[model samples]
Target: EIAITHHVKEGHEKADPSQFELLKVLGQGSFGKVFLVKKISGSDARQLYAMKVLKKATLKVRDRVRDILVEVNHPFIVKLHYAFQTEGKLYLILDFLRGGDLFTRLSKEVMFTEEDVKFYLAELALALDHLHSLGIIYRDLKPENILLDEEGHIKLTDFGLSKESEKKAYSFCGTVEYMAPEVVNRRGHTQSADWWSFGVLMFEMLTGTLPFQGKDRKETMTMILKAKLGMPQFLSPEAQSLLRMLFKRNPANRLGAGPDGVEEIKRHSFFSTIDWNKLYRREIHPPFKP
Candidate 1:
C-alpha cells in the first residue's frame, strides 16, 4: 500500500498537484526520488499509487519514462497510469506491486522450487512473447525486471533498456551476462534478443546464480560473446536441454519463439505441460504462495 504523501497542496489537487508534500523516500534513482503518494480517486476516498518525481534541473531531458509509458501497454507489464510536470519536476504515477521484485525474493532464498520456477518462467515467456510480437526487444530481462504481484503473478518492468527494433538494432543495451553474442559484438539484433535475455533469466531463476558470470563486466562480456555454459549440479536433463537451445551461437537457431514463433517454444519439452490458455489468464496455482 505505497502511498504518495509528497505535499498537502499537491494532495489536495491530486489531479493537478502543484507542489509535493515530500513523504518518506521510497527509492532513489538516476534522476530523483520516488514516494508513496496518497491520491484521491473517487468521491475523495484516499488511494495509493507509486509516485516517481524526477528533478527537471537534474535530468538532461524530461518525459523519457513518460514516453515509455505511452509506447507500451499490457497487463503483465507495470502500469504507468499518469504523467505530468509540476513545479520543475516530472511526476510519473506507476503501479506499485506490494510483493516487491523477484530479485529481492531470490536474494533471500537464492533458489526456487521447480514448480515455482515453472510458473515464473511460463509467465516470463508469455510476457516476452507479447513484447516481441510488438517488435519491442526487452534488452534487460534479468530478475530485477521481473516483479511480483499480489496474486504471485509475474509483472515485467523497467523498460528503460528496451528498444523498438523495427528491423535490427546494434546498440548493446543489456547487462553483459544476459546479452547475446551478436549484441556483444555490435552485430545487430532483432526481437530474438529477448530470447537470449530470457535464457539468462531462466537459467538464473532455476540455479539461483548466473551461469556465465565473470570477474567483472569485461570478463562477463567476453563470456557472453563466447557462450560456454558449464554444467551445474542438480539441473535436470530437460533444464539442460533448454539451456543449450537458448545459448546457441547462431541467433536464428536460439531456442525461443524464433521464426517458428512462440509456437516453437510452447512446444518445447521443457514447457510440456503448461496450458497456454490457462497461463494467459493466470489461473495457474503455483506450488508456493507469496
Candidate 2:
C-alpha cells in the first residue's frame, strides 16, 4: 500500500511503492509495466493512478524518456505525478485513464467514424505540437500509445522512443509500418518523422490497414524506402491531400516540417472545420467514447 503525502513545502519528497496499492496492469513494454494503483489512504475512486515500474538494470536515471516526461505538462499528454526509485527498480506514477488505449478500442471496433477520427487526431496534433515546442521529437506515434480519458479525449503516452533533438536523430527506432522513409533509410530523421507517422496513422484509421505493408518485415522496409506513394480509393480528397502533403520523402518538403510547424497542418483543408482553440480547451464534444 502507498500513502503519498501532499507536500506544502518548498522541496518535494520522493515517492515509494509502499505508498500505493497495486490493483492491475495498465500497459507494458520492453522497459517496464504501468500498473493501475490507488493510494492507501485515499478512498475516493477517482484517485486511482497508473504506476510505471522499470527495472533499474534496464533503465538509467538519465534516460531520455524520463527526462522528457519530467519536463512535460500538457492537456492532451499523460501527466507524471511522482517519480521515485528503489534498489533495483524505478517508478513513475502517472494519471490513470480508465477508457484504455486507442489500439484496444480500434481492435474491438475495427474502425472509427470520420468525426471520431478527427476528434482523436485533433487532440493528438495539439499534443505533438506541444512536444515540438519543447524541442522533443516523438519517434513513435501509433494507436497503442494513444489513450482515452474518461471524457473520451485522446492522451498520448509512451516516450520510450522520444528524444530531444534540435536537428536530426540517427537512431532507427519506431514500428516499421509507421516509420518515416527518412528513418527507414537511416539518413537521420528530424521532427518531421512524426508527421510521416501521423499520415500513416490517419491512413490506417480510415482504411483499417497500413498504407504501405508487405508480407514480410524486410519487404515492408523495401517498400517504404522505394518512396512511391499510394492511397486507398475509399479516402476522401481532403484525406488524400493530407496524406500526400506528409508523404514527401524529403523531410524539408513535408507539411509539418516547415518554420510554421504544426500551424501548417492546422491550416490544411482537412482540418479547416476544427476550431483549434475550442478543441485545445476541450470544449468540443467528442464524437465517440471508448
Candidate 3:
C-alpha cells in the first residue's frame, strides 16, 4: 500500500459558527445530523448555515472521512467552512443548500428529462473537474448525497468517503449498489469509481430503476460482477453509449476518465455541446425551473 501524505494549507479556517442559532433539522445519518442555523450576531443580516454534529464515538470510525472533508475546498462542491471540537461531538459548519437532496426531486419527478439530465450532468462534471484538479476523488455520487442550492443548482456533498487520490485508490468505500466493480472485487481501483457511480446514477435518473438490481446486496453485486447489464431495448442510444463507457469493469479504462483524464470523456459526443465557459460562470440557465 502507498503511504498516505498530507498537504496542509498554512491559513486557518474561517466561518466559525460558535454564535449561530440552531433552527431545524436538515438531515440525519448513521453518525450524526445536520441542522439549519442562523447567525445571531447583533448585525441584522441573517446568514444561514448547516451545522453537522458528529458524536466522538462515531467520529472515531469516521475520522479519516472527516479529515478528507476538512482539507478540501471548492465552490461547486459543498464547502466545509470550519470545524469545532466539543467534549462529545464534532461540529462542522458547512454551506447550506435549501433545495434539499436530489432524491427529493427524484421522488417528485420519477426521472429526468433529457434537458434536465444535461443540466445536472454539466454541473456534476464541473464539480468532478474541480475536485480532480485538486487531486481529490469523490467516492459517493448518489442522488441522496447531492444537495441543491437556493437557486436549485446541484452542490455535491457528503464527503464521508471522499479522498485525495494522487493517482488512484483501492479502498472499498461508497454504497455497494453504486460501487465500481474493481472496488467490490477489492482488486485494482481508482478515481474512476466516481464515473461508474455517475453511470449508475444516470441510469436510475433515466429509467427509475438501477441498471443492476437483485433481491439482495449480494445478488445485486453478483450481477454487477457478471457485467451482463443488458440495457432495455427502449433505452436511449446516447444513454446506452454513455453507460457502456461508464460500466466498464476496468477502472483504468472506465467511461470518461475522471479529473486526471477528464478531457478524454468531455470530448465524447454526449458532452460535445456543453458550454464549459458558460457553466463555470453559472451563465447557462438550467433546463428545469425551480
Candidate 4:
C-alpha cells in the first residue's frame, strides 16, 4: 500500500509512484498515458486524480512550459497538485474534473443560447487574462482543451502548445479551424492570437459551425486568411458585433488585443449582464450542471 497526502508540507519531497493506484486510463498519446488514479493512503485518501505520465525523451521545450501549471492557481484553470520525475518519465497529478469537455457537450447540444455562451466566454476570458499576465500564451484554445467541472464551470487545460514569452512567437501551431490569420501566415503572433482563437470558439458555440470552414486544410487556411465572416440572422446584434470585433484580420486591431488587454473584451456590450467579480469568485450559477 502507498501512503501520500495532497497537502504540501515543508521538506515533503516529490511524489512517488507507489503513492497512487492506477484505476483506469483516461487518455493516451504519443508521449505517454493519462490515468485515473486514486491515492491509497493519506488524509485525502480515496480522492481521485488525473495522473499524466510522459516520457522524458519524447518531450521537447514544452517540459519547462508545463511547469507553469504548478504555479497557476486559478478557479478556471486546471489545478496541478503534484509533480515528480523518474529516470525516464515525468508525472503530473491534477484534479479529476468529472463533467467532461466542452467539445462533447457542444457536439450534443449543437449550439447554446447567447446567455449560456456568455457565461462560458466570461470565464474563459478571465482564465486567458490570468495566463497572459504571467507572460504565457495559450496557443491552442479550442473546445477540446476546455473541460467542465461537475458544476459546469470551464477550466482551460493542455498546455503542451503554450509558450511563455512576452514577445511574438513564430512557431506555426494551433487547430486549423481556429488558427488566427497571423499564425497561419507565420507572422509572429503574441497573446492576441489566443484572442482570435477565443473568437472562433465563441462563434462555434453560438452557431454550431466554425466561422471559417472550407473543403480541406488548404482551403480552410485560405478562408481564415481571406474570407469574410458570415453572421447568422438568428444571432443577436450584440453577438454579431462581438464576433466581428474578435475576427479582425489584423491582430493589432482585434478585440482584447489593445493595451487594456482582456478588459476590452470584458467590457463589451455582449457581456453587459455579467458580474465579473462574482464570476471570478465562482459565485455566479452556471447555466448547466453537467
- Measured by lDDT, the strongest candidate is 4
Error (Å) of candidate 2 at residue 132 is 1.5
Clash pairs, model 3 backbone: none
The model with the greater lDDT, 3 or 4, is 4
lDDT of 2 at 145: 69
List per-candidate RMSD values in Å.
8.6, 8.0, 7.8, 7.9
Off by over 4 Å in 2: 1-49, 54-72, 80-90, 98-101, 161-173
lDDT of 3 by residue, 116-142 (tens): 776777788778766555555555557
What TM-score does structure 4 among the candidates reach? 0.74
Write down the worst ten-residue block by lDDT for model 3: 1-10
Give per-model TM-scores: 0.70, 0.73, 0.72, 0.74
The parts of candidate 4 lying over 4 Å away from their true place are 1-49, 53-60, 63-72, 79-91, 98-103, 161-173
Please give the lDDT score at residue 127 for candidate 1: 77
| Tens digits of lDDT, candidate 1, 154-184 | 7876343222225553333456778777777
Badly placed stretches (over 4 Å) of model 3 are 1-49, 54-57, 60-75, 83-87, 98-103, 161-173, 258-260
* Residue pairs clashing, model 4: none
**Whole-model lDDT per candidate:** 0.63, 0.69, 0.63, 0.74
In angstroms, how far off is 153's CA in candidate 1? 0.8
Model 2, residue 111: what's the lDDT?
61
